[PDB]
């Protein structure tokens, strides 16, 4: 009953239908990053008894980010050659 649905709702056959009904302009990129931040915020943070997990996630994410950034310079000391 709807053209645009949550990408999980849509099927594989109409997969491209979803890919083409949606927009791509940078404004529609900010209007996505914002939705992500605000889902996280209003679901795990903006609550009267926020906990560690309300924060630890972004930290342990930034961690993996800056680990991927560094993969190149770390292929030079693998303790074993044939992995």
């Amino acid at each position: 009953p709807l053209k645009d649905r949550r990408l999980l709702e849509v099927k594989l056959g109409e997969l491209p239908s979803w890919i083409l009904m949606r927009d791509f302009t940078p404004s529609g990129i900010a209007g996505a990053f914002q939705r992500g931040y605000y889902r996280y915020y209003n679901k795990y943070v903006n609550v009267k008894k926020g906990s560690v997990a309300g924060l630890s996630m972004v930290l342990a994410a930034y961690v993996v980010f800056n680990y991927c950034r560094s993969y190149k310079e770390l292929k030079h000391e693998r303790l074993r050659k044939y992995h």
Partner: peptide
């Protein structure tokens, strides 16, 4: 099977 929804796959 190409009529499935995503979550299942």
């Amino acid at each position: 099977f190409k009529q499935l929804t995503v979550k299942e796959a």
